[PDB]
């Protein structure tokens, strides 16, 4: 056995633990991101074993053209697309932070990557798996989709959009084959974020509100993604999945 | 006495209802909406009677220049601004039904008006209520901020996303004497959705999923507005206020 | 117009407050508390002006006798029940912390209080609003209702009920004209709170999780309970209004 | 390996689903319900291959003795608790309906089964997961914590008290090494619920308000449990986790 998958994001971080488990799992990958060249080097890397089995496509989910071929390009490889990751996501610069200072060119860039990207990828995936009868799609949303991360406001905002876009396509797809959930991961140690969790008094301070008293981990992240890509999950639909160590719990 | 409202989407519906509520209760209104045409035959059958307390001000919220020469012309006409009601809004037109097949145009337009207009204006408004030490923005969010609405993707994901950066706004300026909470009105009868609920048959069904069996008015819209916008919820930041006769409870 | 409510734990806090808007707003009351002595020495030092609009019963809303009589002694001397305002509630000694450590004793007080109270109280008066065809019942439950209050097990138990509660009433009887919402308070200074926030060092922690950097006040719990057993909330029901400073927005 | 787990509500339904797949996987189970005899019957039929690794025992979770006596025959037997699912559950007979015309002693017991059946096991089991520092707690709540089930008055207000009890649980103790969570079924197909699901026009009407136009199994919430019980939520805390097939995302 051996699903198609299409993972956005999955050059580091979460999409690439994801992509991984896929992977691991006998499963096929279109790996998407943002570089052609950092796709081979991680290629080369973390997926040596699976050579074949992961098409590496350079693609800006903000951008229709890119996504539609990233698409095209999956069914012409593998001949169908039974998984829809939506992983890719950014925060914004040291600049996107509250409201009213962050730079409107950042707001738009952050609504661009984390929600015209998902509602893209979807709309590229969806006829096929309509097509199909059956498909699955895991949105990486945010705890953030719930409460607000304070100071990173375009973020919060954007994330928001991503839990509402989830239940949207579950509510008009769930009669027809198709399962749509999120997972709000809360503080996951990655590249977007090492930058706050290396300072002592920043990664105190998350801590501080997490009951867990523990970061999480992109193979947690990857360890939600599949239990709600599988069978597992057949009757879980619409629904966020939080993996916080408490921190929306309180 | 008197406080100054900016509200947008002024000119029709919810926003006509709130525009001529504040004006009632002695306050001075920057009414915005599109149509400097309409919104002078507003002001002429709605708001003769306050004459120059209602400045009407054509903007498309999902434009900075406009939003932000708005912004200049309430504070040149009343010097100051204390409330900001962000409850223009659209819905995409017939085609913006389901994800797959919204044409990504209407995508785009609906995410523009109802998420970056609101980023716009608290933006401008921002600078201005923190110099002045206090303001309240509220935000005409929906239930589908909370809930899809089969059938409207796009407006469903939109609201997702006004929730958050109501939270977010909430979150970062409560300590600066800020106030950001969000109207979710349920169905209500206005010209977005006059449309469908003039068909009885369409308004049956949409009355199935309303646990109070009543289709809600601008009126009530207007009322949850000025208690979150008063002195009676100085302690209500952060929240969402859902107003939809039970359509969410169930 | 004059309204009669019933409101229990009327002889301080909240309740307090609650029974002193609504006879300065000239209706009349029926109030509940555990103290007949407390209840006099409340109406002498509070309610003097009102002496015969606000009917002291002597009533342990956990008792379903007590309940009864109290619900028929309102009929008799003021012919009707229009608001029921549910506020009696206790947070459990200072044994009843986290879970394993707090008594089985303590657990099922809180939960005979809180809970059954507020469902006895329901069930008394609800034939009478159904007969009336018309009746507004406000639950006082807890941000508790939606995150967890640290070392509050008990407390925090018998919130979750009172939202449920809360919804399952507006479900079952809206169309029959019967309103039924919760108002989620945050931290509130109150004897039942008064304690912690005494002193410095917890006040201090507690303000560290509030936003707006302020604990609130029952003339503001007063001021959302009053807003949703009117007329300016007509189409509000099943839903819970959260007035807690931004506490439950991060 | 071999982890040791309680099961409450054994003998039938989703409590047997669990119980046989935590033996399956070569757990030892701690099955408990109300009748020996049924246990036994369930013994013979249903774990016949397992014998030893279970242990029935008589027990009402609403009853605190009966709990102590059963956490410390599954010591005596087994050595350890790593496990503890509270899925024991009542939905109130046919008088158990709205509210009003709920009988207090209906109410009562739907609560001391539902919510201080939960408590006790939690109360019996957490010394012992806080001696060994590690310890995963499920409970089976019910989409009913979420919205309101019409006509259901006691079961949808016992459901929000254990949804906020799971949270409850997971922030006290989730520095501790505990995880505590919660499973939201919507209709599901077991022996409480067959009556309804059996008759026709029942099915159909449940089956309209459910967007993957499905009914759960017991299967399903085994799945969902296995997953919140397992290595794949090491940072699943304080969650909800729904399995509707969309119910409440519309
Ligand atoms: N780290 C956390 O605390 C945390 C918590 C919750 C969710 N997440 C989500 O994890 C997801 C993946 O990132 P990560 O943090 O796990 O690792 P990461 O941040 O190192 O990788 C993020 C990936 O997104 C890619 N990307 C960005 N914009 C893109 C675009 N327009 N088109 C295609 N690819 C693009 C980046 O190149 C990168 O490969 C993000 O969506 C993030 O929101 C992270
Ligand atoms: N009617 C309902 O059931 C309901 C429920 C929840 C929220 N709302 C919100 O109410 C708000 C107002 O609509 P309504 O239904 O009350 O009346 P309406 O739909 O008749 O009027 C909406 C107003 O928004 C204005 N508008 C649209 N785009 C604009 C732009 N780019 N810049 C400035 N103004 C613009 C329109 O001109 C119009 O005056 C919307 O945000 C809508 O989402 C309505
Ligand atoms: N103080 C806060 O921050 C806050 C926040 C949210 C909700 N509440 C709720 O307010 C309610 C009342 O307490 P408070 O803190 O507002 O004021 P309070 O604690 O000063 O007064 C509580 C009242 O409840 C009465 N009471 C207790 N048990 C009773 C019973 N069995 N029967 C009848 N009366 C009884 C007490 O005598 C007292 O008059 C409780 O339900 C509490 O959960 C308080
Ligand atoms: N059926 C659904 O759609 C659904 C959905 C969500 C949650 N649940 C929950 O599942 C649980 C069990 O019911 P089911 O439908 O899964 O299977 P079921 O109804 O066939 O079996 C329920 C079990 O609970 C046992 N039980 C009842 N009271 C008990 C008590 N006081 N002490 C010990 N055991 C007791 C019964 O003997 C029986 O073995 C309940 O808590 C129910 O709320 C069911
Ligand atoms: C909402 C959340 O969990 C934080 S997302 C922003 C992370 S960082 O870039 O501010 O480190
Ligand atoms: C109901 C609402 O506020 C917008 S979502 C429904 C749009 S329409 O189909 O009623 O035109
Ligand atoms: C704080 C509140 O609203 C009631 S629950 C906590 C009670 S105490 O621990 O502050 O005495
Ligand atoms: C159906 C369910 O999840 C529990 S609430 C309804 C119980 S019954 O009416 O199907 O017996």
């Not at 299409?6 to 488990?21: D, F, M, P, Q, Y």
């Not at 990233?70 to 012409?76: F, G, R």
């Not at 969806?126 to 498909?135: D, S, V, Y």
Request: with cysteine.
């Amino acid at each position: 056995m051996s699903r198609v998958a299409i993972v956005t994001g999955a050059s580091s971080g979460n999409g690439l633990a994801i992509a991984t488990r896929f992977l691991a799992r006998g499963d096929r990958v279109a790996a998407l991101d943002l570089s052609a060249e950092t796709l081979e080097e991680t290629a080369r890397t973390h997926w040596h074993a699976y050579a074949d089995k992961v098409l590496r496509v350079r693609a800006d989910v903000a951008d229709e053209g890119d996504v539609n071929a990233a698409i095209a390009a999956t069914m012409e490889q593998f001949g169908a697309i039974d998984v829809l990751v939506n992983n890719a996501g950014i925060t914004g610069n040291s600049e996107a932070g509250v409201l009213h200072t962050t730079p409107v060119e950042q707001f738009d860039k952050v609504m661009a990557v984390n929600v015209r990207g998902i509602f893209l990828g979807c709309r590229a995936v969806l006829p096929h798996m309509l097509l199909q009868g059956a498909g699955v799609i895991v949105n990486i949303a945010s705890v953030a989709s719930l409460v607000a991360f304070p100071g990173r406001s375009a973020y919060t905002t954007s994330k928001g959009a991503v839990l509402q876009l989830t239940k949207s396509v579950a509510v008009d797809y769930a009669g027809s084959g198709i399962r749509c959930n999120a997972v709000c991961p809360g503080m996951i140690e990655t590249p977007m974020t090492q930058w706050r969790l290396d300072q002592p008094e920043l990664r105190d301070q998350v801590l501080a509100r997490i009951p867990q008293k523990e970061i999480g981990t992109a193979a947690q992240v990857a360890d939600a993604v599949m239990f709600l890509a599988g069978e597992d999950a057949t009757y879980v639909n619409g629904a966020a999945l939080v993996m916080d160590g408490a921190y929306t719990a309180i």
